[PDB]
C-alpha cells in the first residue's frame, strides 16, 4: 500500500524497497524492511544534508535494500551520498556497507564496531572513528554529533544527534511507544541499558523528535518508554 504522507511500516514497504519520510529540514529518515528469524520487521536509518552532499546515517539492512536507498535518495533528494557511519555492528546497521563502498561513499564505524562486525563475519566500514570508547564520549562529524552512550542494545551503540534540528536518532538503543518487548536482547546489556539511556536524556535533553532503530518517531517520552521497557524485560 501507499503511506500518504504516513510515517510508511511494513504494510507500504515490501522486502527490497525503501521509503523516505522528512523529519525537517535537511534531515530525513530511511525505512526499508528485512527478515529475521522468518519474519519481516521495518527498520529506520537517516539522511542528513551536509551543504551540497548528504551524510547517511546506517544501512538500509542489505545489498539489495541498500542500493534502493541510493536510487530512492538520487529520486527524491538528488545529492550525492558522500559517507555514511554505521551505529553498531549487526546486519541491519552494516549490511549494504560494500554496495555503499563501491557506490564511493567512505563508510566509518568505531574501531569497537568494526571489530564486532568482523568477527560477526558482517561487512565492515572502512574508517575507524576514535574518540568514541567511553560511555558520555562524543565526536562532532559533519552535521552530526556521535554520542556513545553506553551497553544497551549492544555494547557498542552510537546514536545520532542533528544539533540544527534537535533531532536524536537512537538507533537500536531507542525503542517506540507502541513496544512492549526490548526485541533481540542476543548482544544486549539489560542492566546497563537504562542507565545508558539516562546518559542520552541527560545530554540531549532539547531533543524535539526522537527516532527508534525501528517502527515510529516521537518525542522524547521514546526514551522513558525504552528503559521502562528494558526494566520490564
Ligand atoms: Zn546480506
Ligand atoms: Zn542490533
Ligand atoms: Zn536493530
Given at each position: ?17 525503501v ?63 558522500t559517507?555514511?557511519?554505521?551505529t ?25 564496531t568494526?571489530?564486532?562486525?568482523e ?115
Open positions: 500500500g501507499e503511506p500518504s504522507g504516513e510515517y510508511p511500516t511494513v504494510n507500504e514497504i515490501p522486502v527490497g524497497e521509503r523516505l519520510y522528512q523529519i525537517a529540514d535537511g534531515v530525513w529518515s530511511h525505512i526499508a524492511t528485512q527478515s529475521f528469524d522468518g519474519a519481516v520487521y521495518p527498520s529506520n536509518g537517516l539522511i542528513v544534508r551536509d551543504g551540497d552532499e548528504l551524510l547517511l546515517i546506517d544501512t538500509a539492512w542489505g545489498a539489495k535494500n541498500t542500493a534502493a536507498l541510493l536510487a530512492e535518495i538520487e529520486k527524491q533528494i538528488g545529492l550525492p551520498v559517507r555514511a557511519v554505521s553498531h555492528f549487526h546486519d541491519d546497521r552494516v549490511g549494504g556497507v560494500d554496495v555503499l563502498r563501491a557506490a564511493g561513499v567512505a563508510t566509518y564505524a568505531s574501531p569497537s568494526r571489530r564486532l562486525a568477527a560477526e563475519g558482517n561487512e565492515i566500514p572502512t574508517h575507524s572513528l576514535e574518540g568514541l570508547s567511553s560511555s558520555g564520549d562524543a565526536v562532532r562529524f559533519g552535521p552530526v554529533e556521535l554520542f556513545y552512550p553506553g551497553a544497551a542494545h549492544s555494547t557498542d551503540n552510537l546514536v545520532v544527534y542533528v544539533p540544527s534540528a534537535n533531532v536524536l536518532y537512537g538507533g537500536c538503543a531507542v525503542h517506540e511507544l507502541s513496544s512492549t518487548s526490548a526485541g533481540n536482547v542476543a548482544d544486549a546489556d539489560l542492566a546497563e541499558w537504562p542507565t545508558s539511556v539516562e546518559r542520552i536524556q541527560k545530554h540531549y535533553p532539547e531533543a524535539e523528535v526522537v527516532i527508534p532503530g525501528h517502527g515510529l518517531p516521537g518525542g522524547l517520552d521514546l526514551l522513558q518508554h525504552t528503559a521502562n521497557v528494558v526494566k520490564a524485560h
